Write a protein that binds this DNA or RNA. Structure first.
Lengths: 107, 109
RNA sequence: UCCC
C-alpha cells in the first residue's frame, strides 16, 4: 500500500495489534525497502508525562480513543505488517514528536 | 547498568531469534533513567548495505567486531536494558556523527 | 472492534 510519514496505522505485532506512528522519511517509505520505522502508540494517557512523549487527541487522529505517542518505543516493521490507515498527525503535533524524537536519540 | 550511547552490544534480536550487533542510539539521560528499554540500530555484516544513504560502514579495526560491518540506520530496535550485557566497544565520535546524519535522514529529523 |  501507500505508506507515508506522519500517518497513523494499525500495525500487526495471534499478533498483538497496535496503532503506530510512521517516523521514517518518505523517500525510504516509497522505496522497495521492506521495512517501516514507527513509534508505538498507546491509549494509556499516563505515558504523556514522560519527557519525549506527545499526546494525540482522538478528534484529530480518528483513533477510537485519546492516545499518546511513545517515542521511547521504536519498532522497525515490514510494510506488509501495516493494516488500516486510520489518520494523519498534523504539522504542529508532528513537530512536537520530532523534538521529543531528538531528545531520546540525542539528535 | 550504565549502557551508554555510541556503544556496541551483542543482542538476540527477535524476528529463531538472531544474535546481531546493535549500536545504542538512545541518549544517555534516558539511558540513566528508570526507563527499562534502550533504542539501538542494528549492525550488519552485509557490507553491501553501506551503499544505502544513511548507513555507515564500520571498519573492523575501530569496532572490535570480528568482521567489517555496517550499521543499518533503517533497522531500529527497542531492547531491554537487561538484554544489553555483551559489550564489544564504542563507535568513535568521527563515525557516530555520520550515524547522526543518517538517522536524521531516515527519520526526517 | 480494536491502556504494570
Amino acid at each position: 500500500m501507500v505508506i507515508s510519514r506522519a500517518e497513523i496505522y494499525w500495525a500487526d505485532l495471534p499478533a498483538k495489534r497496535r496503532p503506530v506512528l510512521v517516523i521514517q522519511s518518505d523517500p525510504y517509505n516509497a522505496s522497495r525497502l521492506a521495512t517501516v520505522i514507527a513509534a508505538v502508540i498507546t491509549s494509556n494517557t499516563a505515558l504523556a508525562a514522560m519527557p519525549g512523549n506527545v499526546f494525540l487527541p482522538a478528534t484529530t487522529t480518528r483513533l477510537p480513543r485519546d492516545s499518546v505517542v511513545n517515542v521511547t518505543a521504536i519498532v522497525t516493521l515490514n510494510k506488509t505488517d501495516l493494516t488500516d490507515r486510520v489518520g494523519e498527525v498534523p504539522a504542529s503535533l508532528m513537530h512536537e514528536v520530532d523534538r521529543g524524537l531528538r531528545r531520546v536519540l540525542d539528535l
